[PDB]
Amino acid sequence: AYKPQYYPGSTSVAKNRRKHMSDDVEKMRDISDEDLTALLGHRAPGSDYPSTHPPLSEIGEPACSVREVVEPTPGAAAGDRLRYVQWSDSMYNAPSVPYWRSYHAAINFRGVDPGTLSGRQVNEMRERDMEEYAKRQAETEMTDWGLAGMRGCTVHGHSLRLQEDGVMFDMLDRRRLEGGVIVSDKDQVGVPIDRKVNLGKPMSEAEAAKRTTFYRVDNVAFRSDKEVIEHVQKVWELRTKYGFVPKA
Amino acid sequence: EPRFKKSMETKYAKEWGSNKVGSTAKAKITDKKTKYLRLGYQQNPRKVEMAKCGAAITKKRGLQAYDPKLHLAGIPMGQRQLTPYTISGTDIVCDGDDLHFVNNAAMQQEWDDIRRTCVVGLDLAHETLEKRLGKEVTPETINYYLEVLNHAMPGAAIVQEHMVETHPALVDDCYVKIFTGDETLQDEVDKQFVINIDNEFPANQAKQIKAAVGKTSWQAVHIPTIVTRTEDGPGTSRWMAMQVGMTFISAYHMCAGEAAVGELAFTAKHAGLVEMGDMIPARRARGPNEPGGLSFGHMADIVQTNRKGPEDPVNVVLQTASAATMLYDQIWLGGYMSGGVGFTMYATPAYTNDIVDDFLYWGNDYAAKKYGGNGKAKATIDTVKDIATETTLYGLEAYEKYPTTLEDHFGGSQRATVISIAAGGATALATGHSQAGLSAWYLSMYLHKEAHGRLGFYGYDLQDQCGATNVFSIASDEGCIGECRGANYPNYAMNVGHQGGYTSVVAAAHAGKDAFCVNPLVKTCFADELINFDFADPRAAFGKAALREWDRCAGERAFVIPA
Amino acid sequence: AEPRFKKSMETKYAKEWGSNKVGSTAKAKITDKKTKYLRLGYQQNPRKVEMAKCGAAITKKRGLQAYDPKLHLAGIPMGQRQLTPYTISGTDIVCDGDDLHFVNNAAMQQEWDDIRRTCVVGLDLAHETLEKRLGKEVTPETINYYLEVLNHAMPGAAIVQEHMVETHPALVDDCYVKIFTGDETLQDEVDKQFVINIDNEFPANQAKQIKAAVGKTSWQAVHIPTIVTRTEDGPGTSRWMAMQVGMTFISAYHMCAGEAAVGELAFTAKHAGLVEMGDMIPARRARGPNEPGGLSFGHMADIVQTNRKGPEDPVNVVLQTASAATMLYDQIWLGGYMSGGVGFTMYATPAYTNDIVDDFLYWGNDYAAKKYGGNGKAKATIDTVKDIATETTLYGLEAYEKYPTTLEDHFGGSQRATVISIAAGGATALATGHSQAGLSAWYLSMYLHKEAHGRLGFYGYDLQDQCGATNVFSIASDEGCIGECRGANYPNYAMNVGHQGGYTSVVAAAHAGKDAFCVNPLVKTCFADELINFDFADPRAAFGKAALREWDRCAGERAFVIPA
Amino acid sequence: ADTIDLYSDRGAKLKSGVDINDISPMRNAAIKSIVTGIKRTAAVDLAGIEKTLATSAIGGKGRKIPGREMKLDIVKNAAAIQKAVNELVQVDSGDDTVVKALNGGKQLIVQVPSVRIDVAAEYVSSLTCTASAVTQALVSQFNIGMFDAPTIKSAVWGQYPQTLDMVGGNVKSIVDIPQKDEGFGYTLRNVMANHLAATCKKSAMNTAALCSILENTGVFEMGDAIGNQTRHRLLAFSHQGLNANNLVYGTTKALGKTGTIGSAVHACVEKAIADKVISADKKFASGYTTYKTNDVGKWNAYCAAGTLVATLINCGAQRAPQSVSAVLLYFNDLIEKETSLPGCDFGKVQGAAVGFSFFSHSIYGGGGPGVFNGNHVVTRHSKGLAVPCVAAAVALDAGVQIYSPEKTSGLVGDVFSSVDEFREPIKAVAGAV
Amino acid sequence: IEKTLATSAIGGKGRKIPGREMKLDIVKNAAAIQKAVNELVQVDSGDDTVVKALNGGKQLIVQVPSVRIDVAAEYVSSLTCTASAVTQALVSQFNIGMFDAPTIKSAVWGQYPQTLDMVGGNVKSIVDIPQKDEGFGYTLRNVM
Ligand code: F43
Ligand SMILES: C[C@@H](OP(=O)(O)O)[C@H](NC(=O)/C=C/CCCCSSCCS(=O)(=O)O)C(=O)O
Ligand SMILES: [K+]
Incomplete structure (x- = not known):
């Protein structure tokens, strides 16, 4: 068939980037379905998924050769709302970086709407489908709950100096260290919730450095990843040349 | 030491208000960690002034106004410490709040001074008088014309009786000067009216301007600020033409309304007119003399730093970045095209804390030493790739080595703008080539994205990703020499972080080498200390107004309202 | 009875003003055909003297020639005839023409800023978006929190982020948002500080008529800062509004701060739910929305608020409308935006000074009311139009002829033609309740006037005049248009003084004392608000107070951030 | 000449060995x-005129003129009005004029005779001659007197000429007014995505094709298909918009149950390698290999097809349109990372998608996919290879958007969808070769 | 075009870009440029395209083939296809390199697309741009 190569580079950062692209990521913690739903803030934990329109089984869909061959996701078939999960990841070697959360979405999940920014990365999907994606990113090495947070608003922190306890600042204090583990007692837009979710011990600085997809000069310098730089320069050169004359 | 050492020490190792940054929250500029004291807005005297004003407004008017407690979640700003800004190249320290265009009179006046200005030829008008009426035009007739024009231009009567006039006390910022390549005319016109090219420009620059303009003559017209604020940019050439036309009637003893006056109207309003820019398309509909129509070459030529200090072309580029980024991002994109809190901090990297300055000086030193001086690097893909890559790596590593700089430029858009200004500016200065500078800007962005796994806000790199391929495209709506791109070049028409940066890249292709980038008439028009805003030193004006000490604001209604 | 202008003519031509000697040497009876020309120069007039002294000080301070009355053509300064004053119509406020130039009169500037900085924005589609996409429940309580936050944020303050720059409240105290609604429960349950209460602001018949038009729908009346509208332009208003409306929905409904539903709320605020004052105009005169060229006469008539305060005097409603509209369209728009310089103050002052147009319009209305049996009762026919227009025109012409003082005040034929046609058109529209009939009368008046005097207005005054009669009832592409929807971009009307504010008064005359609005109940209700800096219910009073430099509601100054 | 096979919207081979020049807008009879x-x-909108008049809602945007209400039984008299409009719009009896009533007489379709567009600068006679004919026909049918005729006219034409367009009027096209063009050649690109989905009755392939025909005809009018661009444009047009070689529909079907955006990227690279469009170039020490192409036009056209495949499978999976912005971005970003070759339109699809994502998920402007078009400042930047995906995405909505074609496009969709070649353009284009 | 390039007077309205001057013998090579533009503007060899050098090679008349206006919204392909054909023909005739090609393009097209029209350019019609229409049907009425 075809075996994807994903991305250049031989550094740990490049290898971690290929892990995130390919969903080859280690499960680090367990988060219950109801705890995740509580943190997301879109419905009561355990409750039925609200609908924005009727289930497809109750709708007369237009005749369309594409609809005939593209299977709806479970959330689309059910008429779920489009809801989201949004993450902020510290530039001090959080495991994830925004574009790579989006590549993880686009490569590995059907029916995604990812958005990449510097201080936030978001994915909108039919609600039940979104929860499957959110759980995977939340439970695996892609999220360190000290260096990252779930933040649907008021995201400030990715580029700020870390707190003295090593955790990334949250203006809204949705999650924090308590007894050596990260705990969270607010939903992702800052609304207090009636539970306290245990999100595990944060990674040490040394483990973050080994798992990060971020290039940082005193860990794995971007300058040292000669393959990635050569790749960038090649794509730039070809885009430039073909914009003048579109000929090999 | 890096150029931003002092500014980072001011911001992160000295008290500001009662933010405790002189004590418990003090940091070394390399520290990766800090304290979050959650003092709220009361740590910052400026915020406290704003809060007390807001509460007084609510009470006086009976309708809710500003209240920091109305932040989302009822958690007020100042959870992190609130820290200051230093105007780059200066020791002026202020709050970000002192730099919003709404709160900074010098910023408003910069835009008013552009909006209210046009350049208008004299040669076609004089030819009309000579041919149609047989009039003789001399320095004496021109001098009387200019005396009457300066009385009339602010809105005073020449011909009729029992007339209403604008009040001089409200319009003292309105006037007309002339400039000319005709050296004899330059000397015979009364000096009060003349922008003397020899006096205002170093000899080499004066020679280059005179070569471009030949023996032609021009009026530099500045209509009243109170008018430009009441009206819009398209009102400027119209106001000018009314009073030019009235003055020709009197100074040449015409019928006060004959066919020759109509040909003088077409001259002033169309054939002889140089506006700052033309109209823009319907979705963003505006007429001439608005920021969307302002080309980057015109904006670079408005800025006057190159005639005062061409020996520091990097400083020329940085001052250009300051004036242009303020206008394009704060007033235009953050005002005209959006609004609200707007885009002060997207723009402040161009003129605060010495960070972009550090990176651009570094890239220029790199390229100057390597290629044998400014302007001497060949404009090729290999030159562009080298300067852009090395400058980008320097900037990224600086943010990584100095956490204070990363925290100041907390948004990726800010960081991407800063580094691409440095990479594009260093390349343009090295090559003397605006297109090469644009190509470097885009390569920088692409490297930056891969280094950090992020770039700017959601929509930052629209133009970025179209960028490399469109530098040397010849397509209808893609091909354009850099100097003639502007805020309506299609890919550039929406987003912060770019327009003022490109203006600085265009300036970099000419700074210290040429007297102007695209228009010697615009360049010469603004070479005038009577213009309220100091286009040679925009940073100093921004800073003086940040302190509420800048004294050249025009257009107020104070004279005709109670205290 | 004596003509309505008797007092004003006595003030102008039989009482001293400054040292003009009109109280003695140059005093006249208001019917005298002759007078003296004393050639006193500008020094007879304290306002001119103040201007001359300021000009000489500017010349000296800046080293560059400024105002000097000696630079008049031939070196003969103004004031060869005596310089005489103006009385604001319906008042005892006496001032110089110089106190009424838009540049010199802060109330005139604020009238325009208050229109330019305003838009109306629906709430229903936004609430529907929240309900459908997110499943949110919208209640009076959620709306009240939304409106509290919106009034904090609209002037330019932060809601979601941290370490933010904000506009200074001291500079933006004129910016706010109110709501109005045809839903009576919502009107009661929203916090009263935010509500334009239709029942409280309008007489019961007008309130009922507004509510019938608006149904149960709900609207935001948004006024962005004056300092911003002055820095920017009219097209900036809806954009400013939409940014802060969007931010407030994010917080008030706990949305992701930037999700697809926010984008549909943006389209709602900026397009589907938006009522601007007017739209863009063509390239030759290129401007975007919320500029005077795009302002329809119906909207301008609806902005003026006299009809909700004093519908029992519909002529006064028409006259106040003529005043606010003529100032804007002739002084600021045609005499400013579209030209400039000394401009067009005196082309406009007949609409609001010396009680002359007022005399003529009261006369025409009395003629038509008596003849046809009251306002609104005359059939809209050629015969009705011909009668009212001809008799009102003859009255006005004969008045100028009987009273040389009035002819000398309205010294330009354009002024006279505007005055008489306002009277003929306004009387016809009031009699018929019909804007088209009023326009037909306006043009017949002009044609009679030209033949009577062998002159009409300035060189280009009657372009629209001569196209006028034939285009009133044309259905051609760019000619057909019901009167209320004509405006400053109707082709024939796009250039010339003396008409746009007059037509606005004719449109108002077709509705004054009969209907709550002419064309748009949303615009009408938006401006029914005493917090708006300019008093749209009594524009004449505001013009006059500001002519005396006593009007104290100017917004937008930079005083707070500059030295004394 | 390059030759392609043309396939239907469901993968049936229609024509074999077609010269790509024969699908050019400059030669194909169906285009x-x-x-x-x-x-x-x-x-x-005859019902609309009747309601506007009855409620004196003249000019839209909240307007009502008290006292000017008129009751005319327009819809009941639709047959007489159709006849009169036909006679007024035609130039000669028996010419190519079409006037037909639709939906119980609530609407008319008018197709002005061809000469009114041939001997004319642009297309607007379809609006103006229709509006004049309707206004005259109503005045005559209902014996309207002079003093009321302007009320009829403004009910039909809206606020024109105070406004540049027929604001609040009842005569419309899927194309907007020429003064709103962003630049030269943009008129045919100013058709809202919702209008296209309604015209094609939400068949995603046909919606993509109609949009691609208009976008690519626009690229020609822009002057951007001359010389060294012509073949390049025709390859990407045929491959993205006309299902050339069944690449779009066949790959969509193969990926339709389990495929993601990444699956579509990989399928495109796989097919390009198998077809000898790209081949391995430089192998780095990690094992990563860059790729080179022998045919930029063909590689670009494969990327254009793949961008649409990814749209159809990802938007189809959501049964919603909003993700199309992300699809156009990430398909192209990822294919560049996979190959070290430029993505579709050399970055311009990705760039349009960056701004389109922002302007469909933020406070600043835009909206849902349905409001965009090739003339929109946000989505204009690709040379015709982005908006056809946007329109297809709209077609796939099962009910998520507020500003859907049902809300924005009912009148024009009802009228334009009645025309077979507009609704079924793939069939038409292939039938002409 | 030749003068615009030689004086770097790119964009008109007083402009000059120092350092970007280019000396091309365009008028002397008008016959070769005519032939190349003819090949670029036509759709099929032998169609109704006209390209003719006038007045000593100082000008061309171009009439685009009818299909470029028939299968199009407006008339503007006469301007755009001509400007593109001339730009490409000049780049080819004079072997212009990539870094200079935007200079050629802006000499031909003027300030477009920063401006809505080809301000300072060298391709013109008697008709003005459709965005300047005062209303529907005014394009053929906008001839000075
Ligand atoms: C609501 C949006 C979505 C949108 O359409 N615009 C927002 C908000 C808007 C508001 C925020 C005002 C407020 O706090 O109430 C304003 C000021 C525009 C306005 N309406 O006046 C703005 N952003 Ni935003 N916005 C900014 C930025 C940013 C950065 C902030 C990252 C961080 O770590 O804090 C990110 C984008 C990114 O991640 O790259 C961002 C996103 C966002 N930006 C998210 C909210 C983020 C959050 O939930 O915290 N902005 C910046 O990167 C710096 C400049 C700063 C702007 C203010 C100024 O220039 O003075 C402001 C520009
Ligand atoms: C796109 C279009 O809006 P429309 O779709 O409503 O016509 C257009 N608006 C704009 O282009 C707006 C430009 C300025 C605002 C956005 C600048 S990018 S900086 C914001 C980034 S963040 O802080 O939110 O992350 C207009 O004409 O108003
Ligand atoms: K203004």
């Missing part, structure tokens, strides 16, 4: 018929 047909077509 000429569709474009000129659209220029000639206007929608009349």
